[PDB]
């Protein structure tokens, strides 16, 4: 929901921004990368931590 | 690294794209949102799972 609303989906952005500069991305895209930036470095971490064998039901 | 290189940072994008349409975001930003999209729904999950008390050293 946050990744969808962050940029509000390129579908509407490209249009609302169509009447301006791509800076819209520098606004949303720059944060859209930072949002996943944390998730990018943490998720990889979560995957390694969880592994597969470990679970304990 | 993937969130940085995905869009290659708005700093360079806004410039390389400066000579074109914002579609660049629909290209990178749309995927930048999907990338975090998975992380957005999974990370929130990882946070809840990890909690704080549980750890077992």
UniProtKB/Swiss-Prot annotation, chains A, B:
In Swiss-Prot or TrEMBL terms, this protein is called DNA-binding protein H-NS
Upon changing residue 14 to H, the result is: Derepression of proV and bgl expression. Fragments 1-46 and 1-64 fold incorrectly but still bind Hha
| PTM | Cells (strain MRE-600) in mid-exponential phase have three 15.5 kDa proteins with 3 different isoelectric points; the major form (H1a, pI 7.5) rises in concentration during growth while the 2 minor forms (H1b, pI about 7.2 and H1c, pI 7.0) remain approximately constant.
Q: Which residues cross the membrane?
A: none
- Report the gene name: hns
Q: What is the effect of changing residue 14 to C?
A: Derepression of proV and bgl expression
What phenotype has been reported when the gene encoding this protein is knocked out? Decreased growth below 30 degrees Celsius. Altered expression of a number of genes. Derepression of the cryptic blg operon. Alteration of chromosome organization. Double hns-stpA mutants grow slower and have reduced viable cell counts compared to single hns mutants in MC1029 and MC4100 backgrounds. In 0.3M NaCl a double hns-stpA deletion up-regulates 583 and down-regulates 86 genes, 363 of which are thought to have been horizontally acquired; 131 are also up-regulated in a double cnu-hha deletion. At 28 degrees Celsius csgD transcription is reduced.
Which family does the UniProt entry place this protein in? Belongs to the histone-like protein H-NS family.
What stretch of the whole protein does this chain cover? 2 to 58 of 137
Phenotype for residue 31 to Q:
Loss of Hha binding by fragment 1-64, protein folding is unaffected
Q: Where is this region: Involved in dimerization?
A: 20-57
Residues annotated as coiled-coil are 21-48
Q: Where is this site: Interacts with Hha?
A: 11
User: Signal peptide: which range, if any?
Assistant: none
State its role. Answer: A DNA-binding protein implicated in transcriptional repression (silencing). Also involved in bacterial chromosome organization and compaction. H-NS binds tightly to AT-rich dsDNA and inhibits transcription. Binds upstream and downstream of initiating RNA polymerase, trapping it in a loop and preventing transcription. Binds to hundreds of sites, approximately half its binding sites are in non-coding DNA, which only accounts for about 10% of the genome.
Protein source organism: Escherichia coli (strain K12)
Subunit (UniProt): Homodimer, also found as tetramers or higher oligomers. Oligomerizes into higher-order complexes that form bridges between adjacent DNA helices. The N-terminal region (residues 1-64) can interact with overexpressed StpA. Forms a complex with Cnu (YdgT). The H-NS dimer forms a heterotrimeric complex with Hha in the absence of DNA; this is mediated by residues 1-46. Interacts with Hfq.
Domain comment from the record reads as follows:
A central region (about residues 21-47) is involved in dimerization, but multimerization requires other residues. The dimerization domain (1-47) also acts as a hinge; changes in its structure probably impact oligomerization and DNA-binding geometries. The N-terminus also interacts with Hha, perhaps via residues 2-18; a well-folded dimer is not necessary for Hha binding. The C-terminus (residues 92-137) binds DNA. Residues in the N-terminus contribute to DNA-binding and to discrimination between curved and non-curved DNA.
Superkingdom assignment: Bacteria
In the induction comment, the record states: Protein levels rise from about 4,000/cell in exponential phase to about 18,000/cell in late stationary phase (at protein level). Subject to transcriptional auto-repression. Induced by increased hydrostatic pressure. hns transcription can be repressed by overexpressed StpA (which is usually repressed by hns). Induced by cold shock (42 to 15 degrees Celsius) (at protein level).
Q: Where in the cell is it found?
A: Cytoplasm, Nucleoid
């Amino acid at each position: 929901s946050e990744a969808l609303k962050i940029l509000n989906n390129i579908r509407t952005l490209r249009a609302q921004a169509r009447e301006s500069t791509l800076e819209t991305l520098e606004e949303m895209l720059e944060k859209l990368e930072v949002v996943v930036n944390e998730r990018r470095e943490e998720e990889s971490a979560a995957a390694a931590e969880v592994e597969e064998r470990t679970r304990k039901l």
